[PDB]
Amino acid sequence: MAQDIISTIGDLVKWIIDTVNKFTKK
């Protein structure tokens, strides 16, 4: 549960939030 939610949110940080910053470098 908590390690699977930390792993899932670190995967969204790595894929979705770093891709939102590949656009939003600025």
Listing DSSP states for the chain in one string gives -HHHHHHHHHHHIIIIIHHHHHHS--
Q: What are phi and psi of 24, to 5 degrees?
A: -85, 60
What method did the depositors use to determine the structure?
Answer: NMR
Dihedral of CA 16/18/23/26: which sign? positive
Q: What are phi and psi of 2, to 5 degrees?
A: -65, -40
Question: Nearest-5° angle of CA 13, CA 14, CA 20?
Answer: 70
Query: Greatest CA separation found in the chain?
Result: 36
Cα distance between residue 2 and residue 25, in whole Å = 30
